[PDB]
Design a protein around this ligand. Structure first.
Ligand SMILES: [Ca+2]
Ligand SMILES: [Cl-]
Ligand code: NA
Ligand code: NA
Lengths: 136, 136, 133
């Protein structure tokens, strides 16, 4: 309908990450409005409203048994997940959120311990989201 | 647009909970329209339409047996997620659905073979969903 | 506002490099998903969400790969793995711009996918988020 904002993004992870750092998904497939920045890993809200996000982060198979990944809004964790495998086999840390955001809010995925697989261009580890409703 | 139904929720889980009747996600982050009730663990439809739901449940079961988390619509399973590990008690059970619902329908998560854990921040086990289209 | 959305589960075992034919169809608004091919075919330009959750078969192998493809190109990859040949899932999600005729589907890239019968363990769903003009 006229006036509905179109805001959506989807990016994969080319480079491996470990420890406690923000995941800079840099294989950008969709980025309507350029509100996702692959140089920072952050989606920045431009319109107050209700947003969906999801993430799938592949643990570094063959090199460790656990890896944690959090979805953050500004300075707060809003979703958490753990990948774990006693044989160091591949496993995912994945979760999804629905959040109200205000302009300037940042949403991003941060590692919270362990090692993440670096996918080159294969998009094994991903971050995506979109606006569901704009506030009146 | 203004006037169109805005219905969306997201909830985590405080501490560890059995869910063999219903898993009552009780850390409610988003509940636009208040169609999710943390005291019953159910999302109740009030508008005919198409709805998305997803869940990510961190479960702990007995050594070496399968466990599962089912998304139910009324008395029917509409998705399931199964996990089994040889000597790892904690694993995720996650799935996603798109469902047509009528007023009165109840959508919720039920567990078997293990207990759900919210982790320290309540955000490791989650349930979310929203209306995609309203029947008109 | 166009209404296009689907959701289906995998009844039968698949293996190797074949397309996954999710044939336990729960939702298929607009009839744009074909359970006999496993493919969603775009009918109007726009922005679409898809997600999949594919269960690896137990007791016959330790790895399985399942990739979401757009036309003949991988747009998301996933691996399931369990060294004791127990279950594991290969899952991912995407947001894609599509044009009419574009096909979106899940294809194996090695390994065996569990045939769930009516259990809806292994799933594929999607919907249009915004239509183009
Ligand atoms: Ca999802
Ligand atoms: Cl590419
Ligand atoms: Na690093
Ligand atoms: Na899954």
């Amino acid at each position: 309908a006229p006036g509905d904002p179109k805001i959506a993004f989807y990016a994969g992870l080319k480079r491996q990450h470990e420890g406690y750092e923000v995941l800079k998904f840099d294989d950008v497939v969709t980025n309507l409005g350029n509100h996702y920045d692959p140089t920072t890993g952050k989606f920045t809200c431009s319109i107050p409203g209700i947003y969906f996000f999801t993430y799938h982060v592949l643990m570094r198979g063959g090199d460790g048994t656990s890896m944690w990944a959090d979805l953050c809004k500004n300075n707060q964790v809003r979703a958490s997940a753990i990948a774990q495998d006693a044989d160091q086999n591949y496993d995912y840390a994945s979760n999804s959120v629905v959040l109200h955001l205000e302009p300037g809010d940042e949403v991003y995925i941060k590692l919270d311990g362990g090692k993440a697989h670096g996918g080159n261009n294969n998009k094994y580890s991903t971050f995506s989201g979109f606006i569901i409703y704009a506030d009146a």
